[PDB]
Paper text:
TRPA1 is a non-selective cation channel localized on the plasma membrane, which exhibits permeability to various cations, including sodium (Na+) and calcium (Ca2+) ions. Four identical subunits interact with each other to form the central ion permeation pore, below which the coiled coil (CC) is located.
Notably, during atomic model building of the TRPA1-crotalphine complex, we observed significant unassigned electron density in the C621 binding pocket, consistent with potential crotalphine binding at this site. Simultaneously, elongation and straightening of the S4–S5 linker and the S5 α-helix result in an upward shift and rotation of S5. Concomitantly, the S6 helix undergoes rotational movement coupled with upward displacement, resulting in concerted rotational and translational motions of the pore helices (P1 and P2). In the crotalphine-bound structure, the S1–S6 helices do not undergo the complete rotational transition seen with iodoacetamide binding, and the S4–S5 linker fails to adopt the fully extended conformation observed in the iodoacetamide-bound state.
Numbering used by the authors:
A (entry chain A): 561 to 645, 654 to 667, 679 to 745, 767 to 790, 802 to 1009, 1039 to 1078
B (entry chain B): 881 to 960
C (entry chain C): 802 to 880
D (entry chain C): 961 to 1009, 1039 to 1078
Amino acid sequence: AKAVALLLSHNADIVLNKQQASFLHLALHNKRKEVVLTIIRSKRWDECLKIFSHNSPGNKCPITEMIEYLPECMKVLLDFCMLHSYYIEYNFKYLQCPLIYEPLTALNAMVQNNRIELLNHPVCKEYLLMKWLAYGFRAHMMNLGSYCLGLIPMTILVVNIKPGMASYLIKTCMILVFLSSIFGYCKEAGDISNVLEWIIYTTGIIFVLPLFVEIPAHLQWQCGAIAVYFYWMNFLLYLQRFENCGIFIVMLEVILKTLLRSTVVFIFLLLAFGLSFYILLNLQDPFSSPLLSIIQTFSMMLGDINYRESFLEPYLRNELAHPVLSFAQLVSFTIFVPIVLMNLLIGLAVGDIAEVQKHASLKRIAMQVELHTSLEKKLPLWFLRKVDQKSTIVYPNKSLEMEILKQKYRLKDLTFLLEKQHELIKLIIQKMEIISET
Amino acid sequence: LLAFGLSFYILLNLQDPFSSPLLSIIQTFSMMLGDINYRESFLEPYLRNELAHPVLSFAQLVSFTIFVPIVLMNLLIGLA
Amino acid sequence: DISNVLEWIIYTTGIIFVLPLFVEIPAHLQWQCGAIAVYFYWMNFLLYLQRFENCGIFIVMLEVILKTLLRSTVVFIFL
Amino acid sequence: VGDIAEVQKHASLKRIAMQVELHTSLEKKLPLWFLRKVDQKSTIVYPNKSLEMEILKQKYRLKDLTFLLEKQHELIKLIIQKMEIISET
């Protein structure tokens, strides 16, 4: 640090090295700390960042390398970017993008290196809030409004006309639903959520189809039911998307995998216990047919049936023929199978939810910046060039990996020094005046 | 409640516990609350072939009694 | 492992069910065997369908499942 | 939940182990004709169709450092044992 600082205090030109590696690039590549501290501290940083590197992507922008390699240095730099007085001022101008470069290039760099201490840094948080309240909130509100433009008339019309058939209020509702569905189709044209909205939009298309050609009533009403139910589910999805954190969509994949496993395990256990109960309790009327048995055992797992009269009372009158077997099936199905299945399912859910509670906890900012860059890239330049802001004011009234890493570098320096010293001492013996004790 | 309410309304209009959308939302409120007779209300009409949407109604039933509450309790217990 | 004794259960019971091909067997025993055989048949087939997947975590936790069931089938009776 | 967490770690690292186990058992209990016929060597895939070893490294580096320092100390002892201490004798 002393060498670089002393050189910079004097005239010491900064130039390309024909490898597209500036002196700052070399300082950062070698993971050096005090030199980068003395270059942030000292002046001429505007000039040092000015030279940049734009030809060979082998050495990227200085800010991106700064993010990737030394996090604490950018922590100090952003601390210097924060201003106090409590007139808190955010200087910006160090997160800036120079117009393969993405709009939020520094943010993408910091979220693809999981440097959480910099994502939760106050300046980046305010930057995200500024971008949100500038354009992201407006765009998301526009999307939700275009969706509600189809949601509201669907509910109104389903409440209006009694199902079971194939005054201008109906026509207005139908035309609103058609235009909203077509607009959403266009939006999607321009993950599980994707197939979900494809389901909803296809079903809305089926519901609006009798505007063109005749469709049977029963199919129309089946489509209407599935469409309304999925409409409200999707709107709950969007209302969750209102919140910045998207943990719910993250765990929705776990939800759907658990549902896929359950919708087959439950059917198979229904079938198994169905024939078991059929051959076991044939003497009674609720098991006369195998179909009756599977439906009634479906009721048994569903949660409502009278155990006393159906099972236990016939035992006392000795009208039942398999006491041990029937009681074994009863205990195994009511307090052995559901308890174990709930234990297994809760264990799987808790493990995956803990995994999410860590990964999505460090990736909330990542998904936020992801949707922000996607929105900016798919949006024209007029809006961004008009709303873009640089200054903000906030009023009060309105842990071991890097330490072991540091130890490793210090020990490497120590062993280099000791090797040099040993070579030096060998130099000492190789020319000595050994005469008195020769 | 609202979603499953209209779903049950348009799905089970043939019966009396879904005559009005208000009746449907209140009775489905009862369904999530925890006390209602499933046998007579749903399964028995299937055998006499008085119901018109077997697959859809059974899908709604399974999704609301052993697919939605299980997943919601799992999610809530995980967060807690 | 538990799967071995499980399939031994199923195969023995299937043998009892096919026994009246050779010699006469009382009907009640035959139907008891049929019930246990069918129920274990479907349970074993669910086991195999899980074995379809590469990961065998379910069979791994099945030992925990059976130990919990062994504790419960006595604690519940005693209570 | 305790046992399921234990499984979610052990079986997570042992899924591949049980897979290879059943594969070797199947291969050993199968004749050689099928394997000698189906055995393949090449495959193509198309896109469209953390602290134990660091402390261990530190331990080896420190062992090397202390060996070097022991040798250097012996060397310096060699330096004293033959010296021309006359001016300050």
